Amino acid sequence: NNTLYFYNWTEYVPPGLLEQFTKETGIKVIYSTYESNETMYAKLKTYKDGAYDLVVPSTYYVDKMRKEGMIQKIDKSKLTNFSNLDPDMLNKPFDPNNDYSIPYIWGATAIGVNGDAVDPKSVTSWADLWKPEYKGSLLLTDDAREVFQMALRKLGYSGNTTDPKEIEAAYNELKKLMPNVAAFNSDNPANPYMEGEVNLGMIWNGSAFVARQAGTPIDVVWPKEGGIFWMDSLAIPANAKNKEGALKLINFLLRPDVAKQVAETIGYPTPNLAARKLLSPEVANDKTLYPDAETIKNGEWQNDVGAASSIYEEYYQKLKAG
Amino acid sequence: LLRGGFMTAIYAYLYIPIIILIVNSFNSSRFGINWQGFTTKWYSLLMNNDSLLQAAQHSLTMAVFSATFATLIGSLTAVALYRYRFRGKPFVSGMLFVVMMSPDIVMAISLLVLFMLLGIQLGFWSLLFSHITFCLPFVVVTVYSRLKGFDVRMLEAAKDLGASEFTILRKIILPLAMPAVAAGWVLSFTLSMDDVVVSSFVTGPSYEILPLKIYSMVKVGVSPEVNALATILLVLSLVMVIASQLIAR
Amino acid sequence: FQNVVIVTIVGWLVLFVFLPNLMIIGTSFLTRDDASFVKMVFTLDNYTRLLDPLYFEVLLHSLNMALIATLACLVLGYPFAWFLAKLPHKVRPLLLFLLIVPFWTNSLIRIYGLKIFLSTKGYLNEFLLWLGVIDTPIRIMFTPSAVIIGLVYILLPFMVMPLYSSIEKLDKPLLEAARDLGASKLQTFIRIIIPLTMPGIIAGCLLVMLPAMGLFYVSDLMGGAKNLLIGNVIKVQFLNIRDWPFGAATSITLTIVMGLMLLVYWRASRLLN
Amino acid sequence: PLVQLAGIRKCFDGKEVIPQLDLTINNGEFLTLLGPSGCGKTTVLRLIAGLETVDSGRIMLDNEDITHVPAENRYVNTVFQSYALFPHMTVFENVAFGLRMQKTPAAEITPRVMEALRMVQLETFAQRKPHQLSGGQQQRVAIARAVVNKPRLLLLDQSLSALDYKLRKQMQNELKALQRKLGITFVFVTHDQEEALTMSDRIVVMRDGRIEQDGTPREIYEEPKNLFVAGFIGEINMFNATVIERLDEQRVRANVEGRECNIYVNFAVEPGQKLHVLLRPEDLRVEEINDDNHAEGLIGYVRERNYKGMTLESVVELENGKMVMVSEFFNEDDPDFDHSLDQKMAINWVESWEVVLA
Amino acid sequence: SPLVQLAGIRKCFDGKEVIPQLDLTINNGEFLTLLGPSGCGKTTVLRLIAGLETVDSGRIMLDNEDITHVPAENRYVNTVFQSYALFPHMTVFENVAFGLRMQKTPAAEITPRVMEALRMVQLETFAQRKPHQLSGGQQQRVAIARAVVNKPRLLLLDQSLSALDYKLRKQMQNELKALQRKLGITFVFVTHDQEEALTMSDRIVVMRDGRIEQDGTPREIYEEPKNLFVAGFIGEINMFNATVIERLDEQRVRANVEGRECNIYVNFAVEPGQKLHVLLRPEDLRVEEINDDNHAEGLIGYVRERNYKGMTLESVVELENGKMVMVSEFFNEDDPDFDHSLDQKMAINWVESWEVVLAD
């Protein structure tokens, strides 16, 4: 009859989903939100020893968060709904045997454009943003890796780089784009588009879905230099009290019906193979949510960097102050 | 007149965004830029929202506790200043003035370092102490300014007539001060409701309160349950102002 | 009792107000550490980083946006309090009370409401569109103008109340005496009314300019990337980067201004009494 | 004539305070307005000064109409009850305010201010703020501020009311000398009787916005015109009289308070008429009776005595039950004389020192 | 009969000595007045008797019982203040009954006593009306009634009737004398006014810087001054300087008073060449106006002011010396009306044996 603390991202859980859980197990659930990975990191180390029961890291911190000792074993016997998941994205180097995380939701990130103002054909690559004709109008996301795995793919490099000469090549070149940025949004990157202030910039593909299910033509033009891909996973912090409760919520989000009701409303691609079929012809078909096999292999996934994490971050926080 | 036009504008400037958060409460678009019909869905959706209801409950309990204790201590201090005259009185007046003229961000960071050095976990108690700390001066000023409009010779006259030091409090000083004691409790209740800077620093995950939960939703900007929760707290605030006047007299 | 009341009030202020400020000034000097947030080692490196043009132009822009909000409050609030003191005594408690009722609605939502009201596709652009005054919309978000409007909108009542007391507390005969001696309405204002009411003006700027550098949510909701206040810098340091000594060294630009503006209040109060 | 007033009216919140007034003020006189509290003296003073505007009438100053000239353009200056005295300026600048605001050339400000400060004996206190002076010095600074502009009429408004009982005696004479030395009219508003009698050259007594009597102090104190005036200044004794018959053209026969003797009356009467008898306490003689010979005056008694220093004041009670309050002097033939309580008495007056009214 | 006895009181405040050393006795049934300049310590004496301040050395006695350290709650002394010290929220009835309630009076005896106390002062009908609906005089009356109902042994008053106007003050002085005669208890009264000290007192104490200058009946203080301060404080006196030549007889002495020789009366022994002070009042000077070099006996002076007060006529005449002397002459004799000019030349004289000469 205890309760759990669920610390998650901005727009994953839709209103009503956690109300279902309570009337089924008697457990009450309190909910909070992130905006990025660095904010999640700092929160867990200040209020150490038992502040939360279920974090949602990105996969490229599941390796980092292991060695500091903030994740623990996941008992894999009571998680009796694991099978329905896609075996494709189920054994990757960061967590070999899946004793530390369970895939939750993946997604992409490409150029967004507004049809009523700018032609979706006048921009086709990351380099078109550096043009001096877009001074003071460009929305950019607020994640260190995303903002950096755009200049690296512009000059031509591997996004997963651990070399202090290419990272320092990014900063010097990414610091000429700042005269064009107007906002740094990572909570709902669709609002400046839907309010009428920005008309060109980075956008998450799932958020553009929600703005097309309302009134606005936001088109996700893929860039020729690639496309930024990522995935998120569920984890249990080391010192938690509702150890049983944390498992019983992951076992509820792996169900097919639960995972499709949320997947249709928010539009973020689901890694649940069982529910990947039971879907609408507008959600499970659109080229921007679920793409071909030619685009996923033309852009780079977000892998671990290791100990050059600080260099990416420390340069980022100086780029903002301009 | 154009003099009335000047006063009409300033009130309209301050009152336009309030009407918007009422009009958009019954709006049906989940975003709020235009008007798309009438609905009462949002209130019902609020009634089931567990997290936001718990947060509102914590806000109300903390406001009540902080306001009560601040009123008590500040009222006693104002009695102490009015009744007695010593050498350090101008110094204490200056201390209170400087405390009241103080930035809130500095207070937040200072209380953070203080609670970190001593070793008290962040949660209920820290928020209580911070709220009392920045609510005291207004209570003190209100009660003291109320009492300063009466003759002090009453107390000597009461002593000459054969009265103890405790009977003066029950029969003379307290009746003259109740109309300002109540105005301090309501003023302290108001601040502890909409305080954001201090709470964002000196509370933890355990005890969550409304400014922090509203902050996330306002940045995401998709849930008009927030607009509906605001209009309830305005009605509940206007009944205390009325109820206080009846009880105070 | 007699001395317990005085002891407790000075015990509370020493533990909760004055000693912690000395803790912050003390920690503006220590070295960083990843375990205890501090390490007992004395450096001036924290203060030298502030003079870097990178972290110094932010303070200057945060200070321009606080003055302009403060000058806006004086220009708009001084006429408003002057006209209100020239009304029948039976209507004043009605208009003063209708000026304080906004505070019972959460402040963080009123700004979010004002964000809609000024957007390109929101109200006041569609309304002002079909009444033939503009050809293209007005874009005032993510600009320095937006933050100033938000600052003035919240902090305006904190300027009217201090000015209201110092106008209502004037002696009427002083104003009549100048009229006899040959003073017009302009020389009466410059040479009598302003000096008599100066302690009320300085009091207002204390309650407006100092909070105007700590309200981080006007910049979060309306400023963007190029318009920041100092309060955002301390929040970022103390909670995300976790560099407490640099975050504390930033706060002292805010105690210096508090000291200087308080000095003018003590000196301008003595000139009158 | 300096100021003429013709048909002034003024209303305040719908209640009338000045029905009708026609009053002339001459050139070089010390005029005082005396009356009960709140009777419109202040309003008349403000109308002459210019701080209020009339509802009907006309105000003329050497035959130039000044009814609608603003207050800052008239040549009338005013002294206030609370010594306005701007707190943030020295005595010198307080005096020089009027000169500066009238575009006086800067060459002569210092001599004029110093002369005005000398008229009132404040030469040395020229650089001292108006909170480190005492009450009298503040009064003097206000008067000097009023006089430096060379006005044509000085309005004083309860000028010497907050001072003690010796400084007032000094400053009344000081003002009287200043007025002669300057040569311009002084209008004074007061509620005290002795000050009005001692400081003035002409008195106007006002009750509820109308003029009752207008004349020199001798006329008002010796020969009043009604019962309000005779009873506002000086203590007076009123005796009810009924006439019996006429004796001649100077004497009349009547009954007063039970005794029937002859009272001097100089207007036409018919038998049965009721008359009022007035006597000042000083003009009334008294003589103790211990023997059984009770005659020559009313009976009376004594209920109270008060040693005044200079004089002795008693309160007596006649057979009817009325108080008479006689006063007595100390002469060479009767030094130190005192009364007891409940001493049977005999009251009589001094043969034609009375006034009788209709 | 002894009621209050101050024997050797000493008091200091903020390191300054306010009462050097004071010995005083108060009788029973009388009316005593303490008079002096502002801040001469009358208020402190009144407070020490009342109980609101405590002494440093000496003892204060009340009916042969030491009360030097009995608080201001058990003494049988009550006080009337200057701002009337009224409780604004209670009714007049509660204001009066407060003192009774604090002494545990039986509930049945309260109302008749309160109504009697209101009646002695003429407030029968305003029993149920709160202050701020009463005039100033009525607040003063309620304060007195609140004081007296407890039946004290000594009713102290502190500049009670100063905030009022003229005629009402003149009425209430007689009212107070009547009340004191009725009740039969001692009244002590502190004032700055000379006329109110002479009018209603039965014994006057004059205090300057904590010392008792003189004590006695009003006629003793107006007619037999003991030093210059007492003579010049109450009423008006004319200070003259005189030098002695020789003696005439057992009761007269020659002198050079203001330049001429005139017989003066000095009782005590005198030796030539010493300085004397001759003190006369405007009461006693007789003046005659000399037109053309006739009857020039006496001092010679010129008139500078003339002040008509209705019953008398005061004039300041300045002597050839340059000395301003005050003259007061009355109309009550058979001189109906007269008036002086502004430069008229006058002669000054005075009646015999009415002078007062002081040595040193």
Numbering used by the authors:
A (entry chain E): 26 to 347
B (entry chain C): 5 to 253
C (entry chain B): 7 to 279
D (entry chain D): 16 to 373
E (entry chain A): 15 to 374
From the publication, what sentences describe this entry?
The PotD-PotABC protein complex in Escherichia coli, belonging to the adenosine triphosphate–binding cassette transporter family, is a spermidine-preferential uptake system. In general, ATP binding, hydrolysis, and phosphate release trigger conformational changes in the transporter, leading to the uptake of extracellular polyamines. Here, we report structural details of the polyamine uptake system PotD-PotABC in various states.
Thus, the PotD-PotABC complex was formed by incubating the purified PotD protein with the PotABC E173Q complex in the presence of Spd, ATP, and Mg2+. The architecture of the entire PotD-PotABC complex reveals an inward-facing conformation, assigned as the pretranslocation state. Notably, only two pairs of hydrogen bonds are formed between the PotD N-lobe and PotB, namely, the main chain oxygen atom of Y56 and the hydroxyl group of T58 in PotD interact with the amine group of K217 and the hydroxyl group of S220 in PotB, respectively. In contrast, the interaction between the PotD C-lobe and PotBC is more extensive. Namely, the residues D212 to E222 in PotD are sandwiched between PotC and PotB, establishing extensive contacts. In particular, the residues E220 to E222 in PotD interact with the residues K127, T126, and R145 in PotC through three pairs of hydrogen bonds. We observed one Spd molecule bound inside the PotD. In the pretranslocation state, Spd is enclosed by the N- and C-lobes of PotD in a tightly “closed” form. The Spd-bound PotD in a closed form interacts with the PotABC complex to form the entire PotD-PotABC complex in the pretranslocation state (state 2).
